[PDB]
Design a protein around this ligand. Sequence first.
Ligand code: MN9
Lengths: 298, 295, 296, 299
Amino acid sequence: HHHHATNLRGVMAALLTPFDQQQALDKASLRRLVQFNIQQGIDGLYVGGSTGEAFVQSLSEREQVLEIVAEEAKGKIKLIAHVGCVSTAESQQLAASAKRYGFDAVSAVTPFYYPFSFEEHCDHYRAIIDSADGLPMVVANIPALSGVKLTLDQINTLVTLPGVGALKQTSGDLYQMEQIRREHPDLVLYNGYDEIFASGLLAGADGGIGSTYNIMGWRYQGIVKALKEGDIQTAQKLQTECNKVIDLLIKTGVFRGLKTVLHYMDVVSVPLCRKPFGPVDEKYLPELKALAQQLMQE
Amino acid sequence: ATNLRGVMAALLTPFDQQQALDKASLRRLVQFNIQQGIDGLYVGGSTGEAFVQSLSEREQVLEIVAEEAKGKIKLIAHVGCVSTAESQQLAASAKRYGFDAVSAVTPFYYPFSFEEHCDHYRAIIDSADGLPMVVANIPALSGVKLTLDQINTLVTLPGVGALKQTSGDLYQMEQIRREHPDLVLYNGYDEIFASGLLAGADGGIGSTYNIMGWRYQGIVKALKEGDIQTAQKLQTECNKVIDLLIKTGVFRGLKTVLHYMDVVSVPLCRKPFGPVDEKYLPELKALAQQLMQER
Amino acid sequence: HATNLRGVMAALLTPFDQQQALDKASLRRLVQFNIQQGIDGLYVGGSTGEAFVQSLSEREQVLEIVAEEAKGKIKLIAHVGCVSTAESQQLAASAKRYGFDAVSAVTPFYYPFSFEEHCDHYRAIIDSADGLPMVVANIPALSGVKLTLDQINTLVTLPGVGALKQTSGDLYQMEQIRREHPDLVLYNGYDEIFASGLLAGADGGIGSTYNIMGWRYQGIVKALKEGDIQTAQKLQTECNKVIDLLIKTGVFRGLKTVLHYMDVVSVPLCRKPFGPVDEKYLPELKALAQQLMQER
Amino acid sequence: HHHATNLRGVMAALLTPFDQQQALDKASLRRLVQFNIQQGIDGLYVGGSTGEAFVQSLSEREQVLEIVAEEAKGKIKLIAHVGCVSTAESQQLAASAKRYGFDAVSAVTPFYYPFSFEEHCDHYRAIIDSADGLPMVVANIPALSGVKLTLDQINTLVTLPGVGALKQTSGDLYQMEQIRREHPDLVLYNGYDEIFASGLLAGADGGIGSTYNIMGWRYQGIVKALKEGDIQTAQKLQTECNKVIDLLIKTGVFRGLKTVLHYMDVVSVPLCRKPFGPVDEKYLPELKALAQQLMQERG
Ligand SMILES: CC(=O)N[C@H](C=O)[C@@H](O)[C@H](O)[C@H](O)CO
């Protein structure tokens, strides 16, 4: 039974990490972006994730973000720390830091690059969980970036590791999504792919964690509500609108396209991702500007 | 191709004990499908085992289904072969037997360029002589890895009137619907039917519809009426069944269920497919019984 | 004692005509052309031979004709493989009637089959060939089937399997297979690695390009046996120079066009849905033919 | 590529040994370095995937670069693998190795996030800048990184200013030959040990590898075999190398090699960093034997 992490369910923005033209942490843009999310009406933030550019950061720089975010939002919203690295030891330290700063849960993407066994994946989550010292874990499953494809049985076994009470399921397999839900009726189950949120909710996901929620996170809230109320037509209406914007972001690069729109909304000073992520192309700037305006009026 | 919209059963081809066509079980299976209230039949598809059948065999199934159901339901003829000329031969015959549409899976095995693929479909469309084309995108089988730009061009070929989308990618499903608002769009994976309609499918084609096409019609109804709980419940019960069938092999597992339901005389597929494993038989009867209660 | 199937064996092309019917006259030529090249034998009606865009009957008339032109002069393997066991079984007995030396089959495709189902498919075709050695044909790029080494080891140990056509690029596996089966007849399937495939432990080859330059591939076998490495590397690199162009052209229609300017194949068409050769490639394929004729 | 000919040869992928608490076992690193020079290795590839880079901080990687300079400068060629995901991090590692006097720097194509090809080019370019004269060895490792380069993409990367070499860890020997035929003077390392001979036949003029840490001499033995034109010997060695690689694949390659390195008492603790677990129990018999076999035939 997963009633232990039931408080973690809902729509949660995957926190982008702001930087300057020196490629340093921009801490005033982080604060600005957190508060911006809080006032959109988000249920929480997922910090230092892929969307967070965690794998172009030092542990120190991840800790500094963790610390600021908690200072800004602890007790206002649910806060989840993505602590995952390839190394178990690196992931434990981050997991220790998140605890110190008063996060509500820790999370880790399956460790990547080297092909570790399933046994070696489970020991890893147990290690972080223990270092989390009371914080429940969100298993992050994002096969398209990690190259770790997990089966149902494997997943099943991970989300019943003691101390686990949630799954970031960034997978387009909406059959697997239903099986997870049918099998784990209590489990907090984060639809992971913004562009399928509605369908994912329908298949048994009870919220999400996504990149695009930083710039229109109320639209996703509307989807949850519209389907709890039997208004499929508005849920569809909202998903379509979300996906015209995801279409744009895909063309421009997702995280830096998001950053750019946050720049025009007066939230982020410098809309750059860390190298080797290049700059957005100037030809999308008119469409990212127009989008910044559409979304502020809404 | 407006009136092609709906829940269409991907018809299984029955075989006798010596692995020839079973004409009797077949006719039984078609009527059994009409009973359940299906909107139409996709004849001689992947589920149909067309790729372990001769052209004349595929034509024999085709003529016989039209005879059982023409007028009563919509009938789509999967005429797809690796060869353009073979494919054309089945298109010409669907025409003759009075079929409503033809369909075709992307030619497989040999890498064919997108240009050649496009040409494949224009030939078959001309040989189908006014019968609208159903494009079948079934990458898990064919290995053809089609994009949106590619799909967009296929579905907007003159003659093309519908897409069978056997893809799990419900972003692309929503994407296709938005570019082509008039397109007949068939969710192809039973096991996401509800989620697929939600993303923009307007009907479906499926193998498991042969044994519970009413549950799919129930998911179209419940969604239509804002009835969210019921659809999810109805999708869930389908997935408990597909769970099993995946353990048993979808095609022969369906066939057995229909064996226990009095429609199919011998529940075998064509070699290289093997028998259903005997440990599973009880649950397939259990499921036969339970589904026979239901309707 | 199937060790007499060892050799360089051209994956025969199946000529069609203007209207896509078989071109039996150009086919008989191509058989006799191949016999001139000093080829050890022919692999008939494989993937190179556009098997799967032909009817069983067309495939049967090709096999017959080859057996008319070549039986007892070279070796002859008949590719009889289909998705259907029963249809593959029609083709093997037919291959047995025409006096072929061997049958072959690619892993049945399109539908996934369990590995148990594959062995039975092989087991059954073997019964229908009635004593002809079976060449199991592993071609992942086209078939989509992904055999493991234990699964390959199991397949070559089935009663009646004499050989393996290993169209993989994985030459760790090529070596592993040799090590498990020192007397296995092991054909290299990718022509663009032939020499390196021999070094890993193939003892011959099967390939589409042997149709136009098989003697180079016999040049390579000799070279290696001579211990001459520069020659073996030059020949391989020369084959890869041609293969580079055949992939720009599309290899099968490329080969038919080289043979068409070698005035051997009457019309250079593969069956639809394949298209003809991009018009703007003709000068190269022309020169390469002139080139290759001057060479032989 | 002329400018880098001196980098041709058989280079061991240096492992990074750790003590019972997973720290840099500094004395063991020093021993392995000398063991490789005492094998007759042409050079050392340091801080790579076999070197367990991505379970280490920049600090620890710099320490290993630092120590290996001490042991190996002026004795054998030294290549530092400086690659990270973040460019700025790789650039730090690249200046370090220039400061320590390495002969060349190397980076595997940045991974996890899917970067466009321009973004890969710029990254080598900016890592090159920091290496300030040191040649760049581009490292193509699809199995691990998940980055699949087309032939033209490889051709563009190996002719970026300052690139002299390519670690081609890919069993596609057609491509190997195309790479050779397209750049006759490029230093082309065969990355997959299980196909060294065939790799060297297709156009590779050397190698970088993990198993070389326990049997380099066989791989050099293969080079000579093929220079002489004795395919019989080339084949025999390649076969023996693959019998061991067969075993290491079963055990875990990097942990396998660290375990044989224990039984030559070259390495103190044979562990890899978590989430690499320990080698299984049933495999310790074969590896001991293997160590003893490898010492006995060494002399
Ligand atoms: C066509 C194919 O998949 N394989 C052929 C037979 O093995 C090869 O010989 C290729 O035709 C040739 O090597 C080009 O890749």
